[PDB]
A paper describes a structure:
BoNTs and [name]-like proteins share a common domain organization and are produced as precursors that are cleaved into a 50 kDa light chain (LC) and a 100 kDa heavy chain (HC) that with the exception of [name]/Wo remain connected by a disulfide bond. While the physiological functions of SV2 proteins remains to be determined, their best-established role is to act as receptors for several BoNTs ([name], /D, /E, and /F).
To obtain a more complete picture of toxin conformations, we set out to solve the structure of full-length [name]/A1 by single-particle cryo-EM. Particle sizes obtained for [name]/A1 were consistent with the presence of a monomer. Based on our 2D and 3D classification, the semi-closed toxin state is the dominant species, although [name]/A1 appears to sample a wide range of HC domain orientations in solution, including the open conformation. The HC density in our best 3D class for the [name]/A1 in solution is relatively poorly defined, which reflects the previously reported high mobility of the HC. The poor density allowed only manual rigid-body docking of the domain into the semi-closed orientation. The conformation of [name]/A1 seen in the cryo-EM structure markedly differs from the open conformation observed in the X-ray crystal structure. Superimposition of the cryo-EM and the X-ray crystal structure of [name]/A1 demonstrates that the LC and the HN domain arrangement is very similar and that the two structures basically differ by a ~ 107° rotation of the HC domain. The state of [name]/A1 in solution captured by cryo-EM is reminiscent of the semi-open conformation of the closely-related tetanus toxin at pH 5.5–6.5.
Author numbering: 2 to 431, 453 to 483, 495 to 824, 831 to 869
The structure:
Amino acid sequence: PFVNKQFNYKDPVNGVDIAYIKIPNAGQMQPVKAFKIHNKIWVIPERDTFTNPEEGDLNPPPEAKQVPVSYYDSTYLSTDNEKDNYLKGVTKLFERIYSTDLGRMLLTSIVRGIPFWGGSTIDTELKVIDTNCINVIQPDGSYRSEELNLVIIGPSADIIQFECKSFGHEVLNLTRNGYGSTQYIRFSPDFTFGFEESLEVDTNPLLGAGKFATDPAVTLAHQLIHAGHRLYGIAINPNRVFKVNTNAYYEMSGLEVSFEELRTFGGHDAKFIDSLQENEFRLYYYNKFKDIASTLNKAKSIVGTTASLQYMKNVFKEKYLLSEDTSGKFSVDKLKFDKLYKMLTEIYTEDNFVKFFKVLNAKTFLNFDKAVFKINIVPKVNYTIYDGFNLRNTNLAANFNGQNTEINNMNFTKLKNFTGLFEFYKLLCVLCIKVNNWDLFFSPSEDNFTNDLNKGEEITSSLDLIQQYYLTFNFDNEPENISIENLSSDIIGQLELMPNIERFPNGKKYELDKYTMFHYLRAQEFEHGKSRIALTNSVNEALLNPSRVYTFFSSDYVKKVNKATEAAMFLGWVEQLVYDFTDETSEVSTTDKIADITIIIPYIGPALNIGNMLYKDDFVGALIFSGAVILLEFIPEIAIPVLGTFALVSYIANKVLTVQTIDNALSKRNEKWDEVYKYIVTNWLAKVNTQIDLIRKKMKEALENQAEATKAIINYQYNQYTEEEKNNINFNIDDLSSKLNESINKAMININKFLNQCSVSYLMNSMIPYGVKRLEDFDASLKDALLKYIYIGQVDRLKDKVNNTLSTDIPFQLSKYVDNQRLLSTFTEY
């Protein structure tokens, strides 16, 4: 196990594994008790008031942070019992992460990744940096400095803001120049992020309603991935922000997401960056690693400890995986460094940890949080090492009911979040309404996507991979805690300076002439008023009178819900309403007049007002007329310029050299096809898939709103009765709620199928042909050039080979480019 001996906040100070410590700070701080849990890893069950002098208070600031959920409470982690609970939770979380294979990989890598000793001015001498060592005070009083790699401190006033911190150098960027530094992780195991999800309906038709609770193991794995990245000095510069346009009303106010976040999240999240930027980052960090190798080569002396040159040379060689030769020449081998970079960049990702834990979690960042939950995971009756919340041999093992906040009510408590539901907003009007900042579309800018297609080019002559990496990994030896000369009494250090993020303006007003989908979504909202709720089809009426609620069903539904009947036929009323709702939500129209669109669901038309046009049948007509363009709020700007014509190098009288040139030309032709396909797929994912995802989520929200509205109407009607009638009927609205939610799911599968078909048909009809035209022109410009190039020996055979190869376009295989069950499933039938 990771934690060898158990720790509690009552053990008297020892001086080896438990001790009062002092960490670097700008001023002077008092010693704080700390528990070492493994080699080079310590924990401080105290609130973060030491590393950040600016964060010297645990009270809510007047300006709320730009985070969808934030819980503030100064009382937490102030009592001894709370500290013991925190220590137990952290130990259990570390054990759970160490249980899995990928977690063991990550923990071994983090323990191995000791920072670099580049604090010396002499070009041939290595000296430890003060900002990477901490002091431990023995009971007698004589403190001793020690190295370390990780520190866990209870979060700051923002109790769920889990952001890694570090102490940098005056002129060096230790987090991105390959030097590395110890990472202080603000982690809290007693709180979790409670979000909603509806993508598991296909695999779990009996998926429960409500939100879901994120496993804290995933959050700790994310923070640990960030710490491991910053330990190896491969983090991306923070100014590389994923810029998003904010001028449009349908555009976000701002989403400060770094490229490091994209790299850490993994999965589809890692596909928002093009291959060019990834290659640039890889080459830049390769240059940094070779610089580090040269620095190791030129260094001859160690000052600060008794450790010899050989031991530290071996330690840093294991840290950076450098190919040192017989003469001690450390070189950055391309293959080993590439494997290490791939492992740290793509293997160590949140998506892989979600797959390994077998827990429900968000796939992209766009489905922001909605609640914060207080949890206790110290007792085994609530959370176990192996399975987590989804305990085995219970009713919570299947369908991920253990992580449900409505089924596992005993383990979760909904706390108050400080960020108001309409605290950050935009004012849209044509009745100026307030639309939440986190409910808006994600619009990437055109600058974030860069390509080298127009540049010329010259011709010369899954879990399986994780298992293989485990079989090829080593867990034999970890770096030792070598004695080091004591540092100063106070470690003077300053946190790494972060780039300033300008406050996004709040309450920007937009004047329009058409009804946005947000207006229609808001028109289907009520306030649980005691007065009778009336359904209507005019969105203007719903948005003016808050008692009225807009509905996109037929007039029969409105008539049926707007009538009045005594308790004699209410028993019939309930079943008629549930049957009509199930019928209308499950309605479908089949057509073949639009390519790749076999389902043309009409009621989407007036629900989200996608077509800017009232009639649903006219929406059917508009869809079969104009393809999947109507769904997208803003048409993405896809532009493939003229491809770089190949430059084959002539080789006179060397026939086999000519053959190698003609083979490399074909290979790079296929690779160019694949790369253009990948670029277009990335554009489709970034600019179109997010819009369809938001439309799907908003349609689910609208359906749930309609169900809640009709449920409120029937509840109000039932409340109007007498007590004897209520007892005789015994109308249990929970059963009807479950029935209507199941009808919502039965409609949701069809809605998912339709939207998946539309989002794949847009790629097949309006994005791929643009590239295919360019590459067909490229083939036309290449075949004649190659024919000129061949003008001795096997002339005829070469001509047949080239004509056969460039006669047909390479087939588009969506499987190799995007890995998702729904998209592949809908692409299969065509």
